[PDB]
Amino acid sequence: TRDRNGTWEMESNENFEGWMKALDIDFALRKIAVRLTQTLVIDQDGDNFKVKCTSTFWNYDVDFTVGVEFDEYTKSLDNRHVKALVTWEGDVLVCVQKGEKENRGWKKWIEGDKLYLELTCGDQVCRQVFKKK
Ligand SMILES: *C/C=C(C)/C=C/C=C(C)/C=C/C1=C(C)CCCC1(C)C
């Protein structure tokens, strides 16, 4: 399915520290973030998405249209400008963030009841799994 709509509660988070370190997020901020429980809210309407990842201190929001490049400034993360592009590869939602870091982006799959998110930077992959609330 290409559906991603819903409220998604994190069940597992693998190598979040390694991925934050690959982005050069400062150590002190990584220590605050690393085991915060995350909720991911996705609103999807045709090509248009609004994605909100929320925690206690610390949010990450992005809105985009599938197939339309957009500038992203990761102000609450590593504070870089990337040219982002989200597309479908079959039923996989794929984002490439072109910029300083190589292999930077994310992918979302659904399998069973569950949303699988892989965040990449350099040689690091962070694997998260969410259940729909
Ligand atoms: C499709 C879903 C995506 C791309 C969600 C990405 C979520 C993040 C990059 C969240 C990052 C966060 C940190 C690096 C610090 C802790 C706060 C978070 C969880 C919002």
CATH code: domain of residue 64: 2.40.128.20
Q: Return the residue matching tokens 């045709």.
A: 46
Return the ligand 1 atom nearest residue 32 CA: 16
Q: Return the residue matching tokens 């949010």.
A: 59
For the chain, the domain total comes to: 1
Q: Is 38 in the pocket of ligand 1 (CB under 6 A)?
A: yes
Among 15, 44, 2, 25, smallest CA distance to 129 is for 15
The size of the chain, in residues, is 133
Q: 86 near 49, Cβ under 8 Å?
A: yes
For this PDB entry, the determination method is: X-ray
Distance 27 CA to ligand 1 centre (A): 16
Among 81, 80, 45, smallest CA distance to 65 is for 45
Q: What residue numbers bound the domain in which 35 lies? A: 1-133
Return the ligand 1 atom nearest residue 33 CA: 16
